[PDB]
Design a protein around this ligand. Structure first.
Ligand code: NAD
Ligand code: NAD
Ligand code: TCL
Ligand code: TCL
Lengths: 257, 247
């Protein structure tokens, strides 16, 4: 595949319906050697299995809320991959009481701090911890959403965190580019992942988008996965600090209702 | 004055060079009645002096780092302004070590947390604490910078904080619009006294903007003259951001 010879670390894989899994599947299909991380011991076994099916036995624990955990994970990784070619950041979180109802009413200093720390800072925290391990030609990738660019009901503070995240992509790309590292993000359209399928009316939402999306269907973890593979491969050597919309063209249209 | 009949709260006055100072002077010139906040004991005197020079005697303490400080401030303001028409959020901060050198090397979890908390969260924090005090037709304004949209050397984490803030503007505008409240931001170009005189040469209007320029745009955005504008980030940088390679 177009990722042959590349070693990529993938986070956020906590289910087969997750975007990180879709991305892993595609990179593996393209010949990349993978390594996975898991948030806590509770997901340890379950993740070692997903990894097994992708030709990998490299499964490390890492809570991005702790600088120590990040440093330890990369140290462990260094034992097998003293050098690798980038990672996929598919991590996000905000307390549940933050993502529902009026934004100004729901947001709190704490909810805000956590959302930005876990959803945005973690991306650069990981980069700092493995910077010396990256090979020239490496590529970092994170996942965003239209909420970073527009006010969307219920997304609330996650919208600010994602806006921070996209800016992070640009500052990271600008700082790491000179050493041969690219940094990009994919703003994905709504997908029914394990986590996503948990929020109320997500079924009806996907239905709404299909009707107003140019390609007339919601994107799949397969679609996102293929674009991710591309963005982490040398085929995208000319792209960096970019937020690629993989939402079927939904954001570039208006009032198709 | 296109601001007569309006009562606005102005934060961030630290000196006569503060953008908030140029803003306050503009609004006063346009007939707005003003109220001021000062961060700490250090700046209290300067603010009282200027508040007085603008016919105001409403000078309250407020450190947006603490929820209690914000509630207390609005509690005091309510004694003289049971209701008002908006406020100018001109507050920003990040530990110094954050704004120098390579971004990836300079940023730290703590520096990131502080920059976002003080520079972005505080804006909605203030809106939360005075929501029921806002009259229909009220307007909120904050200040941002191009660093939010482009990667600018040394600006580092403040760029992410400002990106967060601009998104805050959009979410606040969408949330509060139903109650008759508009929320906007001005992305100001760098104001003359990280040396420049460079932008002053590649900027369309061929000069950097002044706190007077920013002040007038601010007055407008908090006046009924901009009733049709909300959730918008207006670039008041002389057109610098919309040009490329003028060098
Ligand atoms: N689902 C969608 O419709 C959609 C749309 C646009 C963008 N995205 C983005 O895609 C990414 C993946 O989300 P998803 O839909 O696949 O849900 P997901 O539940 O499958 O994965 C999210 C991951 O975040 C990880 N995580 C949270 N806190 C962590 C921590 N402290 N340390 C380490 N890991 C932590 C989780 O464990 C989990 O694996 C996110 O960035 C998300 O916002 C999703
Ligand atoms: N100066 C420029 O060229 C320029 C360009 C673009 C945007 N801005 C923005 O304009 C705004 C004002 O900056 P300025 O140039 O007038 O500098 P300034 O030093 O005059 O004012 C900044 C203010 O922030 C206040 N502040 C900081 N932490 C606080 C806290 N915890 N609680 C309450 N107040 C706090 C300060 O006390 C101070 O008054 C900012 O948002 C800033 O980033 C400035
Ligand atoms: O960013 C997202 C955007 C969409 Cl449309 C659907 C799911 C998303 O991802 C999340 C957002 C907030 C939390 Cl708490 C957890 C997750 Cl998985
Ligand atoms: O945002 C700004 C943009 C420019 Cl061009 C110049 C000054 C700015 O304002 C600040 C940025 C960071 C810290 Cl710590 C304090 C301040 Cl007053």
């Amino acid at each position: 595949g177009f990722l042959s010879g590349k070693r990529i670390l993938v986070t956020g894989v906590a289910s087969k319906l997750s975007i990180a899994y879709g991305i892993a599947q595609a990179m593996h299909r393209e010949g990349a050697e993978l390594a996975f991380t898991y948030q806590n011991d509770k997901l340890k076994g379950r993740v070692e299995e997903f990894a097994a099916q992708l030709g990998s036995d490299i499964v490390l624990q890492c809570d991005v809320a702790e600088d120590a955990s990040i440093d330890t994970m990369f140290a462990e990784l260094g034992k097998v991959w003293p050098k690798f070619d980038g990672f996929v950041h598919s991590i996000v979180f905000a307390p549940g009481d933050q993502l529902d109802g009026d934004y100004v009413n729901a947001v709190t200093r704490e909810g805000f701090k956590i959302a930005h720390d876990i959803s945005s800072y973690s991306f650069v925290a990981m980069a700092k911890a493995c910077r010396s391990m990256l090979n020239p030609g490496s590529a970092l990738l994170t996942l965003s959403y239209l909420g970073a660019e527009r006010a969307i009901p219920n997304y609330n503070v996650m919208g600010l965190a994602k806006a921070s995240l996209e800016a992070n992509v640009r500052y990271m790309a600008n700082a790491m580019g000179p050493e041969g590292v690219r940094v990009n993000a994919i703003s994905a359209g709504p997908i029914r992942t394990l986590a996503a399928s948990g929020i109320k009316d997500f079924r009806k939402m996907l239905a709404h988008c299909e009707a107003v999306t140019p390609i007339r269907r919601t994107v799949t973890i397969e679609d996102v996965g293929n674009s991710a593979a591309f963005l982490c491969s040398d085929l995208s050597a000319g792209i960096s600090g970019e937020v690629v919309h993989v939402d079927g063209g939904f954001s570039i249209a208006a009032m198709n209702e």
